[PDB]
Design an enzyme around this catalytic site. Sequence first.
Site, short mmCIF file in Angstrom:
data_model
loop_
_atom_site.label_atom_id
_atom_site.label_comp_id
_atom_site.label_asym_id
_atom_site.label_seq_id
_atom_site.Cartn_x
_atom_site.Cartn_y
_atom_site.Cartn_z
N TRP A 14 9.99 112.92 56.44
CA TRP A 14 11.41 112.64 56.23
C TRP A 14 12.32 113.74 56.79
O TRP A 14 12.03 114.92 56.62
CB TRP A 14 11.68 112.51 54.72
CG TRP A 14 13.13 112.55 54.37
CD1 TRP A 14 13.91 113.66 54.23
CD2 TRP A 14 13.99 111.43 54.15
NE1 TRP A 14 15.20 113.29 53.93
CE2 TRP A 14 15.28 111.93 53.88
CE3 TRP A 14 13.80 110.04 54.16
CZ2 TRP A 14 16.37 111.10 53.61
CZ3 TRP A 14 14.88 109.22 53.89
CH2 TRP A 14 16.15 109.75 53.62
N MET A 15 13.43 113.35 57.40
CA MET A 15 14.45 114.27 57.91
C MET A 15 15.86 113.80 57.53
O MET A 15 16.18 112.63 57.71
CB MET A 15 14.36 114.36 59.44
CG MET A 15 15.48 115.14 60.11
SD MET A 15 15.26 115.28 61.90
CE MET A 15 16.06 113.76 62.38
N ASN A 16 16.68 114.70 56.99
CA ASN A 16 18.13 114.45 56.90
C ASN A 16 18.97 115.51 57.66
O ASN A 16 18.82 115.64 58.87
CB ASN A 16 18.61 114.12 55.46
CG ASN A 16 18.25 115.17 54.41
OD1 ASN A 16 17.08 115.44 54.16
ND2 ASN A 16 19.27 115.74 53.77
N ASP A 17 19.82 116.27 56.96
CA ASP A 17 20.92 117.02 57.60
C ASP A 17 20.51 117.93 58.76
O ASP A 17 19.53 118.66 58.64
CB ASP A 17 21.62 117.95 56.61
CG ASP A 17 22.12 117.26 55.36
OD1 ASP A 17 21.89 116.04 55.18
OD2 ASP A 17 22.76 117.90 54.50
N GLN A 33 16.87 119.50 57.48
CA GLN A 33 16.28 119.21 56.18
C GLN A 33 15.02 118.37 56.40
O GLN A 33 15.09 117.32 57.03
CB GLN A 33 17.28 118.45 55.31
CG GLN A 33 18.52 119.25 54.93
CD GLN A 33 18.21 120.31 53.90
OE1 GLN A 33 18.22 120.03 52.70
NE2 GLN A 33 17.92 121.52 54.36
N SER A 75 20.81 122.56 52.74
CA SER A 75 21.47 122.72 54.04
C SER A 75 22.24 124.03 54.19
O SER A 75 22.59 124.70 53.22
CB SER A 75 22.37 121.52 54.32
OG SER A 75 21.58 120.36 54.48
N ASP A 138 25.74 124.13 50.81
CA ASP A 138 25.97 123.89 52.24
C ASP A 138 26.92 124.93 52.87
O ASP A 138 27.99 124.57 53.34
CB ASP A 138 26.47 122.47 52.51
CG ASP A 138 25.66 121.41 51.77
OD1 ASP A 138 24.47 121.65 51.47
OD2 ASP A 138 26.13 120.30 51.45
N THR A 208 29.74 111.51 50.04
CA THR A 208 28.50 110.76 49.86
C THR A 208 28.69 109.29 49.43
O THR A 208 27.89 108.43 49.81
CB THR A 208 27.55 111.49 48.88
OG1 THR A 208 26.23 110.93 48.96
CG2 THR A 208 27.96 111.28 47.43
O1 LIG Z 1 21.20 115.27 42.11
C1 LIG Z 1 19.95 115.56 42.69
C2 LIG Z 1 19.72 114.67 43.91
O2 LIG Z 1 18.72 115.25 44.72
C3 LIG Z 1 18.52 114.55 45.94
O3 LIG Z 1 19.64 114.81 46.75
C4 LIG Z 1 20.29 116.04 47.00
C5 LIG Z 1 21.60 115.76 47.71
O4 LIG Z 1 21.30 115.25 49.01
C6 LIG Z 1 22.54 115.08 49.69
O5 LIG Z 1 23.28 116.18 50.22
C7 LIG Z 1 23.03 116.76 51.49
C8 LIG Z 1 23.90 115.97 52.47
O6 LIG Z 1 23.18 114.88 53.02
O7 LIG Z 1 21.65 116.79 51.81
C9 LIG Z 1 21.12 118.07 51.54
C10 LIG Z 1 19.81 117.98 50.76
O8 LIG Z 1 18.97 117.69 51.49
C11 LIG Z 1 22.21 118.82 50.77
O9 LIG Z 1 22.14 120.22 50.97
C12 LIG Z 1 23.47 118.21 51.33
O10 LIG Z 1 24.59 118.38 50.47
C13 LIG Z 1 23.39 113.96 49.09
O11 LIG Z 1 24.46 113.65 49.95
C14 LIG Z 1 23.82 114.46 47.71
O12 LIG Z 1 24.65 113.53 47.01
C15 LIG Z 1 22.55 114.82 46.90
O13 LIG Z 1 22.89 115.45 45.68
C16 LIG Z 1 18.04 113.14 45.67
O14 LIG Z 1 17.93 112.50 46.92
C17 LIG Z 1 19.05 112.42 44.79
O15 LIG Z 1 18.58 111.14 44.44
C18 LIG Z 1 19.31 113.24 43.53
O16 LIG Z 1 18.13 113.26 42.76
#
Ligand SMILES: OC[C@H]1O[C@H](OC[C@H]2O[C@H](O[C@]3(CO)O[C@H](CO)[C@@H](O)[C@@H]3O)[C@H](O)[C@@H](O)[C@@H]2O)[C@H](O)[C@@H](O)[C@H]1O
Length: 432
Positions: A14-17, A33, A75, A138, A208
């Site tokens: 898996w990959m996100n930010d 990420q 991030s 972030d 989000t």
């Molecule tokens: O509340 C805990 C939350 O944990 C997970 O998500 C974390 C966070 O992911 C997102 O934020 C970003 C932006 O895409 O992604 C990274 C984490 O990888 C963050 O540093 C950054 O802000 C979402 O956009 C946030 O809303 C979320 O809190 C899990 O996936 C959630 O289900 C939940 O358990």
Amino acid sequence: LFKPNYHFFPITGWMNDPNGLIFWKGKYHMFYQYNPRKPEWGNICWGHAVSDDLVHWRHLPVALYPDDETHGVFSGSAVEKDGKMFLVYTYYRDPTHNKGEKETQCVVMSENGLDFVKYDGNPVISKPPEEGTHAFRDPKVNRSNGEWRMVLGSGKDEKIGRVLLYTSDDLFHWKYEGAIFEDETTKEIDCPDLVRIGEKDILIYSITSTNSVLFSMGELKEGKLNVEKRGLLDHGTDFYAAQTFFGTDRVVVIGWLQSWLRTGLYPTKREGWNGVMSLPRELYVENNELKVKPVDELLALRKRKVFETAKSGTFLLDVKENSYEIVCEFSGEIELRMGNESEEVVITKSRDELIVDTTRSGVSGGEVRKSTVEDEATNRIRAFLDSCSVEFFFNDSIAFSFRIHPENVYNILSVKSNQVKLEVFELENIWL
Ligand SMILES: OC[C@H]1O[C@H](OC[C@H]2O[C@H](O[C@]3(CO)O[C@H](CO)[C@@H](O)[C@@H]3O)[C@H](O)[C@@H](O)[C@@H]2O)[C@H](O)[C@@H](O)[C@H]1O
């Protein structure tokens, strides 16, 4: 089927930010990420890739790991100081039954871009500045007026999302400077980025609950962003967590080419992976407006011209896969369709509106999005089709990004307008 030909995506998991975007020692570094364990979010590390030219990516070893099973490396950003690379990031501790989640800001250094060492004084910022602060994360760090500046995402009293500002002379000791901005349409703000483009302060940030990247442009005065103009950085369904590169002349942005809202609708997890990065865009200011266009380096992907026309019609393309760019100049209204016998994406300029429809695009369906646009004598669309995405760019001004999952090659192209000039270029596979 769905492995991108010329977008970045993980070798597994898996990959996100996008994280730590920096031009350092002649090469573009992109971290991200990453969970290599499975195609779902968890146990987050920073993956690492590099390119000479923002296009030809090569995978490097995973750069940062959490210390244990109950933490994540969330991030952050990258800067250069004294010739060395520094990564600034949120370190996250899982909630337990008695405790809520805990977020701190930390620093890592590297002298060669391969091995990364932890700052002994971590965390660099140990707790939030005010009470009721959540989603405190972030860190995006840049240089401004002989000093380092950090913006962080946050939420206040489970009510309003804000961007916090800190300053530092050395990257290790930070001073809180207040909330420079707030957006009452969301409870939290992710992935802020404060840049300067021609006399103007521009705050890029993500929300989000609509999965959108917005901007606010204006002037920072007396600890507050005085907003002159507002908008979206992208008008499509799959563009999130945008970040810009440190250490370049242009402002270059890459976003996560996916939506949290639609992640469970997508099929790539069957192949063992999840997540794609957007093509890089240059952000620039012209006539007091923020504009978005593809970076110049993308032209190197163009291999052979498969098709061209100066008139309307329906055409069979000589393409063997979903890896091409449509370049289309037109006047007045247009309807451009790309697809096959079972699937299609449609983009239409109807009067003063540009509309895109991916509902029939493939096995994840899609949506309809639109934006009002200024008329020009000659308009220009560039559409990048890859294995599981389409990105539209209009008048070097706006972009629409969508994830699509076609079961077959989009080898039929239909155009309806006056004064059309359309070309299709096959785009190179960057991997093999
Ligand atoms: O509340 C805990 C939350 O944990 C997970 O998500 C974390 C966070 O992911 C997102 O934020 C970003 C932006 O895409 O992604 C990274 C984490 O990888 C963050 O540093 C950054 O802000 C979402 O956009 C946030 O809303 C979320 O809190 C899990 O996936 C959630 O289900 C939940 O358990």
